[PDB]
Design an enzyme around this catalytic site. Structure first.
Site, PDB file in Angstrom:
ATOM      1  N   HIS A  64       0.819  -1.207   0.000  1.00 50.93           N
ATOM      2  CA  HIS A  64       0.000   0.000   0.000  1.00 50.93           C
ATOM      3  C   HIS A  64       0.860   1.267   0.000  1.00 50.93           C
ATOM      4  CE1 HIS A  64      -3.469  -2.484   1.777  1.00 50.93           C
ATOM      5  NE2 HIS A  64      -3.680  -2.325   0.458  1.00 50.93           N
ATOM      6  N   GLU A  67       1.829   3.742   3.075  1.00 52.58           N
ATOM      7  CA  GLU A  67       2.352   3.148   4.302  1.00 52.58           C
ATOM      8  C   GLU A  67       3.875   3.185   4.326  1.00 52.58           C
ATOM      9  OE1 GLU A  67       0.488  -0.728   4.639  1.00 52.58           O
ATOM     10  OE2 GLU A  67      -1.489   0.138   4.333  1.00 52.58           O
ATOM     11  N   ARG A 122      -3.392   4.743  -2.011  1.00 56.01           N
ATOM     12  CA  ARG A 122      -3.255   3.392  -1.457  1.00 56.01           C
ATOM     13  C   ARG A 122      -3.055   2.320  -2.529  1.00 56.01           C
ATOM     14  NH1 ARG A 122      -5.529   0.016   2.620  1.00 56.01           N
ATOM     15  NH2 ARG A 122      -6.637  -1.858   1.894  1.00 56.01           N
ATOM     16  N   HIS A 192       2.821  -4.063   6.521  1.00 58.37           N
ATOM     17  CA  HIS A 192       1.886  -2.943   6.343  1.00 58.37           C
ATOM     18  C   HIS A 192       2.037  -1.948   7.512  1.00 58.37           C
ATOM     19  CE1 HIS A 192      -1.040  -4.438   3.226  1.00 58.37           C
ATOM     20  NE2 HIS A 192      -0.264  -5.525   3.392  1.00 58.37           N
ATOM     21  N   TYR A 244     -10.642  -6.600  10.610  1.00 56.47           N
ATOM     22  CA  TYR A 244     -11.867  -6.731   9.828  1.00 56.47           C
ATOM     23  C   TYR A 244     -11.668  -7.743   8.698  1.00 56.47           C
ATOM     24  CZ  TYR A 244      -9.222  -3.086   7.270  1.00 56.47           C
ATOM     25  OH  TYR A 244      -8.242  -2.356   6.637  1.00 56.47           O
ATOM     26  N   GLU A 266       1.317  -5.061  10.973  1.00 59.04           N
ATOM     27  CA  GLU A 266       0.914  -3.656  10.931  1.00 59.04           C
ATOM     28  C   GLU A 266       1.797  -2.887  11.902  1.00 59.04           C
ATOM     29  OE1 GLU A 266      -1.388  -2.451   8.961  1.00 59.04           O
ATOM     30  OE2 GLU A 266      -2.250  -4.338   8.240  1.00 59.04           O
TER      31      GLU A 266
HETATM   32  C1  281 Z   1      -4.572   1.202   8.905  1.00 60.05           C
HETATM   33  C2  281 Z   1      -4.499  -0.246   8.407  1.00 60.05           C
HETATM   34  C3  281 Z   1      -5.363  -1.134   9.314  1.00 60.05           C
HETATM   35  C4  281 Z   1      -4.931  -0.331   6.916  1.00 60.05           C
HETATM   36  N1  281 Z   1      -6.343  -0.294   6.698  1.00 60.05           N
HETATM   37  S1  281 Z   1      -6.932   1.068   5.896  1.00 60.05           S
HETATM   38  O1  281 Z   1      -7.868   0.613   4.826  1.00 60.05           O
HETATM   39  O2  281 Z   1      -5.867   1.837   5.328  1.00 60.05           O
HETATM   40  C5  281 Z   1      -7.811   2.061   7.036  1.00 60.05           C
HETATM   41  C6  281 Z   1      -7.263   3.303   7.448  1.00 60.05           C
HETATM   42  C7  281 Z   1      -7.933   4.103   8.399  1.00 60.05           C
HETATM   43  C8  281 Z   1      -9.158   3.661   8.943  1.00 60.05           C
HETATM   44  C9  281 Z   1      -9.735   2.425   8.554  1.00 60.05           C
HETATM   45  N2  281 Z   1     -10.889   1.867   8.973  1.00 60.05           N
HETATM   46  S2  281 Z   1     -11.055   0.463   8.190  1.00 60.05           S
HETATM   47  N3  281 Z   1      -9.698   0.460   7.281  1.00 60.05           N
HETATM   48  C10 281 Z   1      -9.038   1.597   7.565  1.00 60.05           C
HETATM   49  P1  281 Z   1      -4.194  -1.792   6.010  1.00 60.05           P
HETATM   50  O3  281 Z   1      -4.567  -1.552   4.597  1.00 60.05           O
HETATM   51  O4  281 Z   1      -2.763  -1.950   6.349  1.00 60.05           O
HETATM   52  C11 281 Z   1      -5.082  -3.279   6.618  1.00 60.05           C
HETATM   53  C12 281 Z   1      -4.979  -4.467   5.606  1.00 60.05           C
HETATM   54  C13 281 Z   1      -5.800  -4.212   4.324  1.00 60.05           C
HETATM   55  O5  281 Z   1      -6.860  -3.547   4.432  1.00 60.05           O
HETATM   56  O6  281 Z   1      -5.360  -4.707   3.267  1.00 60.05           O
HETATM   57  C14 281 Z   1      -5.492  -5.784   6.239  1.00 60.05           C
HETATM   58  C15 281 Z   1      -6.762  -5.844   6.888  1.00 60.05           C
HETATM   59  C16 281 Z   1      -7.263  -7.078   7.366  1.00 60.05           C
HETATM   60  C17 281 Z   1      -6.504  -8.261   7.203  1.00 60.05           C
HETATM   61  C18 281 Z   1      -5.238  -8.210   6.564  1.00 60.05           C
HETATM   62  C19 281 Z   1      -4.422  -9.489   6.400  1.00 60.05           C
HETATM   63  N4  281 Z   1      -4.903 -10.229   5.223  1.00 60.05           N
HETATM   64  C20 281 Z   1      -4.730  -6.969   6.083  1.00 60.05           C
HETATM   65 ZN    ZN Z   2      -1.979  -1.775   4.205  1.00 59.10          ZN
END
Ligand code: 281
Ligand code: ZN
Length: 304
Positions: A64, A67, A122, A192, A244, A266
């Site tokens: 992403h 990040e 992203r 991430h 989630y 993360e």
């Molecule tokens: C801040 C982290 C949690 C990122 N999620 S995000 O879409 O950018 C996001 C940012 C701010 C608030 C949010 N509320 S829900 N998602 C949010 P991420 O992008 O690194 C999480 C990642 C994804 O969404 O791809 C992820 C979520 C769930 C499980 C996994 C592992 N397969 C990875």
């Molecule tokens: Zn991410």
């Protein structure tokens, strides 16, 4: 103009991948596993004392674009691996017995975009049919419960799953490499930010992996180790319940390929600065993360 304590643009990271290989030709080799939508080489570094048929751990950063601490960490890891090989007994053992495949930045096009036009981007930067909306979420683009729970069919959405599984050149390249090297790869680590978590399967469904009890104990031990340096507190568990549901993730796809140790990290922080983590925190963040990666590596070597 490279620094390990600042965020580096792609031109600088690219130059660094070639530099660190040239300086350490007997410990590091570099290849390009493919090209991005915009034609940029996707580099992979192979870190280890060369040998016939060594097991491997695969780690990527920069899925992403926004990040930035993720990209920073893969660079830190490689320097630490080279600097401590031949000096610290554990890393020396590590690189003698296994190889690390480090992919410093997967989504290069998006990363360039966060430096030039939109810091908060992203997705990838591939075009989509019938719309002006750009890009697919690489971590929804893998063939694991593809485009079910936690992904969007809308190309304008941040979790757009893409026109098909592996539709993106970048994710196709990564999946291809892993498939071609499936017999050697014992663990998959994907970096991430943010939220301070260690996640494992599953994210595309609420079901638990066959070795759930083992993965939980390992994550528990790894976050304990991470905290020892600066007291940084991580939570951990299966992706779907721990943050989630997110179908189409690379960690789930790696796992269902048979790679039994598959983790998403993360990194810092927990929202005070979020993706815009101050450069003054890069070193401390990378140092503590090193401890968790080394813990998981030592575990893997003892469980081949
Ligand atoms: C801040 C982290 C949690 C990122 N999620 S995000 O879409 O950018 C996001 C940012 C701010 C608030 C949010 N509320 S829900 N998602 C949010 P991420 O992008 O690194 C999480 C990642 C994804 O969404 O791809 C992820 C979520 C769930 C499980 C996994 C592992 N397969 C990875
Ligand atoms: Zn991410």
């Amino acid at each position: 103009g490279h620094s390990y304590e600042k965020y580096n643009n792609w031109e600088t990271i690219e130059a660094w991948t070639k530099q660190v290989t040239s300086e350490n030709p007997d410990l590091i080799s570099r290849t390009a596993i493919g090209t991005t939508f915009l034609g940029n080489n996707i580099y992979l570094l192979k870190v280890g004392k060369p040998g016939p048929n060594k097991p491997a751990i695969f780690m990527d950063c920069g899925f992403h674009a926004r990040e930035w601490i993720s990209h920073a960490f893969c660079q830190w890891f490689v320097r630490e691996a080279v600097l401590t090989y031949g000096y610290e007994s554990h890393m020396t053992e590590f690189l003698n017995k296994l190889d690390f495949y480090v992919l410093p930045v997967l989504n290069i096009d998006g990363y360039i975009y966060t430096w030039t036009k939109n810091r908060m981007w992203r997705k990838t930067r591939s075009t989509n049919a019938g719309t002006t909306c750009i890009g697919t979420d690489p971590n929804r683009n893998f063939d694991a419960g593809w485009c079910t729970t936690g992904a969007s069919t809308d190309p304008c959405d941040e979790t757009y799953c893409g026109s098909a599984a592996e539709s993106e050149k970048e994710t196709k390249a990564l999946a291809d490499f892993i498939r071609n090297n499936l017999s050697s790869i014992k663990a998959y680590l994907t970096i991430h930010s943010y939220s301070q978590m260690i996640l494992y399967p599953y994210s595309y469904d609420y079901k638990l992996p066959e070795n759930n009890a083992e993965l939980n104990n390992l994550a528990k031990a790894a976050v304990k180790e991470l905290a020892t340096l600066y007291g940084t507190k991580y939570t951990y568990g299966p992706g779907a319940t721990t943050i989630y549901p997110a179908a189409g993730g690379s960690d789930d796809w790696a796992y269902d390929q048979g790679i039994k140790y598959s983790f998403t990290f993360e990194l810092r922080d927990k929202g005070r600065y979020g993706f815009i983590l101050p450069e003054s925190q890069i070193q401390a963040t990378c140092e503590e993360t090193m401890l968790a990666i080394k813990y998981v590596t030592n575990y893997v070597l003892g469980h081949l």
